[PDB]
């Protein structure tokens, strides 16, 4: 994979250095329905007029971006997204801006969030969990090799495509950094203890998050939960983990190594890096090449109606998309 990654970095760097800009405009799309929301924006199902293709259009109010102090994070998101390429990363198809909004148009992944299916089904069996986990492992290997840290892993940000494979979305907290960084960001249940403790951290926080995701997929609930974020952080920092009775010995050993408070001992962060995870007994049945090639048969295939079907997504309250005749925050988002 060393020769693959070296070429992958070469491809990535060209686009990182000279980013795509202004590859569409709003009136090229008909907005249909909201697919999901986050603290500052919504993702809408749209239909592209000239092609007839459906896409997921992420809309960011520039004023809200600024208010929540997310200018650099939003610039990060777009710059990274337009430069990456991997089978399990949602593709950015177009991006643009107008007087009021930033727009990131992605491929529409109709199978819905892993979150919905996980909560509905209750929990995934270990092979089912392993199938998804493997894709995240390879994806993080790819991202980290590019000096990228992801920082927002959770079932809400993992979409199931028509083949039952994972598409990672939401690069809102993604950042290109060599060495450590300090921003307190992510989702409380998925925060590594070094994020909470404000001491600076590196890509090993993504591996901790992988442990949290694997646990939640396999248990049906997270390893650290409570009614309030501050209560969750207390449990994370204690580091005490308890496993369901049905967890295999192999799964528990892997999780102890991922949910490891000690950075000199956390899997993924050691001398042999990602190979400590890839070669773990829990992944013994995993053909890593077959996964990458999408040749492994998926355990779950979302019911797929029409190309613009949203039946795998919850309904959200709609809201008009406003565009002022006055340009807002022009200089701030010049590079977008």
């Amino acid at each position: 994979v060393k020769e693959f990654l070296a070429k992958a970095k070469e491809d990535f760097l060209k686009k990182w250095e000279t980013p795509s800009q202004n590859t569409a405009q709003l009136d090229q799309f008909d907005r249909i329905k909201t697919l999901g929301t986050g603290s500052f924006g919504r993702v809408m199902l749209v239909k592209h007029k000239e092609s007839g293709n459906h896409y997921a259009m992420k809309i960011l109010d520039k004023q809200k971006v600024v208010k929540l102090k997310q200018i650099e994070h939003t610039l990060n998101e777009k710059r990274i997204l337009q430069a990456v390429n991997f089978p399990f990363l949602v593709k950015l198809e177009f991006s643009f801006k107008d007087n009021s909004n930033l727009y990131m148009v992605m491929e529409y992944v109709a199978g819905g969030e892993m979150f919905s299916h996980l909560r509905r089904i209750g929990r995934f069996s270990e092979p089912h969990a392993r199938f998804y986990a493997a894709q995240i492992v390879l994806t993080f290997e790819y991202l980290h090799s590019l000096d990228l840290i992801y920082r927002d892993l959770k079932p809400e940000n993992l979409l199931i495509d028509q083949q039952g494979y994972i598409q990672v979305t939401d690069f809102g907290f993604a950042k290109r950094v060599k060495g450590r960084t300090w921003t307190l960001c992510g989702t409380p249940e998925y925060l590594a203890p070094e994020i909470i403790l404000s001491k600076g951290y590196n890509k090993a926080v993504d591996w901790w998050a992988l442990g949290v995701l694997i646990y939640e997929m396999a248990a049906g609930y997270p390893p650290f939960f409570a009614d309030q974020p501050i209560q969750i952080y207390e449990k994370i920092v204690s580091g005490k983990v308890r496993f369901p009775s049905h967890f295999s010995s192999d799964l528990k050993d892997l999780l102890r190594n991922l949910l490891q408070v000690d950075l000199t001992k956390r899997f993924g962060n050691l001398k042999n890096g990602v190979n400590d995870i890839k070669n773990h007994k829990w992944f013994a049945t995993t053909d890593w090449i077959a996964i990458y090639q999408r040749k492994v048969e998926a355990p779950f295939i979302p019911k797929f109606k029409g190309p613009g079907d949203t039946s795998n997504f919850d309904d959200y309250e709609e809201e008009e998309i406003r565009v002022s005749i006055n340009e807002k925050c022009g200089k701030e988002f010049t590079e977008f």
Binding site: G36, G38, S39, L68, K69, Q70, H73, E113, F115, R119, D152, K154, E156, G172, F173, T183, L184, C185, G186, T187, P188, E189, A219, G220, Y221, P222, F225, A226, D227, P229, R242, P244
Partner: peptide
């Protein structure tokens, strides 16, 4: 059970990310 305690908790829906 842990499952029951989770299901009765206030954080079983989609979880918001945090910044600052």
């Amino acid at each position: 059970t842990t499952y029951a305690d989770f299901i009765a908790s206030g954080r079983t829906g989609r979880r918001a990310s945090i910044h600052d």
